Amino acid sequence: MAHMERFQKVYEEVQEFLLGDAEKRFEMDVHRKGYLKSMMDTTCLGGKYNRGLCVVDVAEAMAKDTQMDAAAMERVLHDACVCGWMIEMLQAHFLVEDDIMDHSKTRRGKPCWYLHPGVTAQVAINDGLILLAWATQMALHYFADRPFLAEVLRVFHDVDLTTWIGQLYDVTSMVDSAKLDAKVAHANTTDYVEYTPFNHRRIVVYKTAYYTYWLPLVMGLLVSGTLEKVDKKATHKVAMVMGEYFQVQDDVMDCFTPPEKLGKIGTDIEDAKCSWLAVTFLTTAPAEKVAEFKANYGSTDPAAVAVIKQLYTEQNLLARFEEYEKAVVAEVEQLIAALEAQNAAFAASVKVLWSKTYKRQK
Amino acid sequence: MAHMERFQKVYEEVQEFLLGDAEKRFEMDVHRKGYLKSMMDTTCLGGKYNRGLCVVDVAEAMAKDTQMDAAAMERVLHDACVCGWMIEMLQAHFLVEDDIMDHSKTRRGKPCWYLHPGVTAQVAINDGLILLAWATQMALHYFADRPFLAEVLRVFHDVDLTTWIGQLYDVTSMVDSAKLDAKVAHANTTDYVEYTPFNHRRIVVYKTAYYTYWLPLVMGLLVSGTLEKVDKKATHKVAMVMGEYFQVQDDVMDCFTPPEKLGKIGTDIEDAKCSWLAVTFLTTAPAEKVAEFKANYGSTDPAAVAVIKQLYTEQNLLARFEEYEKAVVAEVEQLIAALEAQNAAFAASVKVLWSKTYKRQK
Ligand SMILES: CCCCc1ccc[n+](CC(P(=O)(O)O)P(=O)(O)O)c1
Ligand SMILES: CCCCc1ccc[n+](CC(P(=O)(O)O)P(=O)(O)O)c1
Ligand SMILES: CC(C)CCOP(=O)(O)OP(=O)(O)O
Ligand SMILES: CC(C)CCOP(=O)(O)OP(=O)(O)O
Ligand SMILES: [Ca+2]
Ligand SMILES: [Ca+2]
Ligand SMILES: [Ca+2]
Ligand SMILES: [Ca+2]
Ligand SMILES: [Ca+2]
Ligand SMILES: [Ca+2]
């Protein structure tokens, strides 16, 4: 990737600043610094870097479009790499906490952070919070004399909130919303009434699309000072369309992609999740198959999990995804053409992002 | 309390805004809105409001000294109340997460948030993140046109990181630090070599003093436009001294104050915590008493815990606390006296915060 080399160099720079800053400010000892170095390395690395690299892709596109000289371009790209590492650290925080919440086994081909024996969910909750804090630390340090600092913090913290609200919708999706009460313990759904297209879209837009698609594009525009050059409404719309699709892919892959290729072991079936597969099944399958699904979903019994996957296969859900994917492309292309008519440089950076997304395998 | 009625009015205002903003931005449903409302109420209310009220106390004191008109004064005090609710919501976030981490039973005389039957630790972790997010949402909304927005965000997010690092020290305090390894589990200490005055002070300054003392003072100065008018080094010093003392009180109370008065059930003894009592016992007690301590500390057996309390009693730990407190009083009065020479209005606000702290019973 055009910016991978720079991006990794900035990771080591940022890691040195953050660890050294903790030493200076908090009387950090060598052992806990070493712990935090390895924590950062394990939680922030080993992914695709789609979000972080997007920021740099956009910023370079926009920096070229506005003809910045050598010194201005060097700054924009370094600032873009820092913003990209903010998002990757936000992501690290999201997955550390999510892996605890989902009680998962593997992340990026390694044990989940909390499942490292010298960590535990207790310490991992804390570690995830330090990761979130470091993201803001980077902006506060590197962007201290940038007029865009305020705008960066504003969009970052809006998206952070958006994501946890999406997580709220996700964790409570197998509970009949009317039964949702802090004071009263309640069973998980047996009727699946709220497993609707609307409810799935609500979950995936807020939990995924804002931080995976909207945030990187906006940060890229912010650090290059070109946010005013683009149609903000069209940008938001293509970010929502692509992000929803990205999460639909993730949902499909939970069931149909071997965990070793994916790097993680999804338990959407065991955990009765309102996934794209479950919702599309429940709204398109015949009555008896809907009934058999309800008797088998949300169970840790391998035999029950096998029935769900056979039911999904029978209902041709992979073919239904292919047709959904076809519609997404038509919609993405139209939105990108609208963007291109206004700023071809930005539209091209949206094409890069879409290219990394469309028909991805992990 | 002079500002309690205004402070509680601003709570309802902020709560309506945050819940309504969720509806407007995240397609929030009535049942989850109702969940979040009771979540906010259970986690943000019931405490002493020392932190929140301090902001308003400081801001009024400083605003009286500048002689503004009535419209300006009203804005200062409202902004102060919002800033105070930022800290109360930060506090709320800290305790939700800490109660999960400590696996605790009660908070402010009610069950811990995660122990509410219709909640669970899984959902609670995410409720805690929402609370954290909302604190920044308040600044981004109410201080959108204010000069101090950037500095507010800076100090708040700096303190958030400091508290999480302090928490890291706390949760790793009972493991020998050389053995701290993500890949390898290690037992709690048997020797307690790292149960030192230095290590206890490091924990409490960073987990407590910054967010409980330093942050309220600085936010009060920021909203009233007066940070430049005070000695920053001297303010920081007295905040560190008062805050360390405050946590020593909390530690003393963990062992000696009935859980029914405190509103919470401490497990510092069963969890082998590096409390002020442990450190002070270990450094001052005769060797045969040290040995009996090591034979009993960090055990859930109720009789072992009672052995520890008896050991603390026979070593006169309460008398040792009363003498530490005397030195703290001497030191705080000196620091306040020097503050008064420089800014009498600000020094008086520090005396209010101190009077609420000194010899408190819960
Ligand atoms: C703690 C905030 C969680 C944010 C978030 C948003 C989207 C996807 N994830 C993780 C994925 P996965 O665990 O990567 O498969 P999900 O559990 O299927 O949703 C986490
Ligand atoms: C998640 C960070 C929590 C930070 C923090 C700082 C100070 C006190 N607490 C909780 C207290 P307590 O539970 O109120 O006694 P501690 O467990 O004794 O430390 C938490
Ligand atoms: C949003 C989501 C599906 C969580 C994992 O996201 P991802 O596939 O981009 O993961 P990496 O950061 O590991 O590439
Ligand atoms: C810092 C600490 C000891 C944690 C509890 O703080 P606190 O005693 O101020 O609690 P309240 O917010 O309930 O008053
Ligand atoms: Ca997961
Ligand atoms: Ca999840
Ligand atoms: Ca998934
Ligand atoms: Ca604790
Ligand atoms: Ca606790
Ligand atoms: Ca305590």
Neighbours of ion ligand 6 (CB under 5 A): A 98, 102
Residue corresponding to tokens 């009317």? A178
Cα separations in angstroms, B117 against A181, A186, A187, B112: 9, 8, 11, 10
Q: Give the torsion sign (CA, A86, A88, A93, A97).
A: positive
Q: How far apart are alpha carbons A315 and A285 in whole angstroms?
A: 7
CA A94 to ligand 1 centroid distance, Å: 7
CB contact under 8 A, A177 and B31: yes
Q: How was this structure determined?
A: X-ray
| B122 contact A CB<8A | yes
Count of structural domains, chain B? 1
Residue B96 lies in a domain: yes
| A177 contact B CB<8A | yes
CB contact under 8 A, A172 and B100: no
CA A166 to ligand 8 centroid distance, Å: 28
Residue among B204, B331, B203 at smallest CA distance from A28: B203
Q: Which atom from ligand 1 is nearest to the alpha carbon of A204?
A: 7
The nearest CA of chain A is from the CA of B2 a distance in Å of 33
- Which residues on chain A are in Cβ contact (under 8 Å) with B23? none
| B302 contact A CB<8A | no
Residue B73 lies in a domain: yes
Give the residues across from A358 on adjacent strands: none
Residue A53 lies in a domain: yes
For A196, the token pair is 């609707």
Q: Which residue's alpha carbon is at the smallest distance from atom 1 of ligand 2?
A: B94
Would you call B107 helix, strand, or coil by DSSP?
strand
| A167 contact B CB<8A | yes
Q: Which residue's alpha carbon is at the smallest distance from atom 14 of ligand 1?
A: A95
Q: Which atom from ligand 2 is nearest to the alpha carbon of B211?
A: 6
**Residue from A24, A25, A26 to probe the interface with B (highest B Cβ count within 10 Å):** A26
End-to-end CA distance of chain A: 17
- Which residues on chain A are in Cβ contact (under 8 Å) with B99? none
| B123 contact A CB<8A | yes
Would you call A316 helix, strand, or coil by DSSP?
coil
Residue B280 lies in a domain: yes
Q: Which atom from ligand 3 is nearest to the alpha carbon of A250?
A: 3
- Which residues on chain A are in Cβ contact (under 8 Å) with B134? 161
CATH of residue B283: 1.10.600.10
Q: Which atom from ligand 4 is nearest to the alpha carbon of B362?
A: 8
Residue B362 lies in a domain: no
Strands B110-111 and A106-107: unpaired
Q: Tell me the structure's resolution in angstroms, rounded to a single decimal.
A: 2.1
Half-sphere exposure of B106 (CA within 13 A, CB side): 14
Domain ranges, residue B213: 4-357
Q: Chains A and B: how many Cβ contacts under 8 Å?
A: 160
Would you call B110 helix, strand, or coil by DSSP?
strand
For B106, the token pair is 């009660």
For A289, the token pair is 């198959």
**Phi and psi, residue A72, nearest 5°:** -70, -40
| A21 contact B CB<8A | no
B348 exposure class (CB count in 10 Å sphere: 0-12, 13-18, 19+): middle
Residue A169 lies in a domain: yes
A11 exposure class (CB count in 10 Å sphere: 0-12, 13-18, 19+): buried
B331 exposure class (CB count in 10 Å sphere: 0-12, 13-18, 19+): middle
Cα separations in angstroms, B260 against B264, B265, B266: 7, 8, 11
Residue corresponding to tokens 């920096």? A63
CA B84 to ligand 4 centroid distance, Å: 14
- Which residues on chain B are in Cβ contact (under 8 Å) with A206? 26-27
Name the residue type at position B231. D
Residue A362 lies in a domain: no
CA A355 to ligand 3 centroid distance, Å: 16
CA A236 to ligand 2 centroid distance, Å: 40
Residue corresponding to tokens 């400083």? B62
Cα separations in angstroms, A45 against A3, A50, B177, B266: 16, 12, 25, 38
Residue corresponding to tokens 């969890």? B271
Q: What is the CA radius of gyration of chain A?
A: 21
- Which residues on chain B are in Cβ contact (under 8 Å) with A150? 149-150
Q: Are A192 and A277 in contact (CB under 8 A)?
A: no
Q: Which residues contact B43 (CB under 8 A, 6 or more apart)?
A: B92, B93, B95, B96, B113, B127, B131
| B204 contact A CB<8A | no
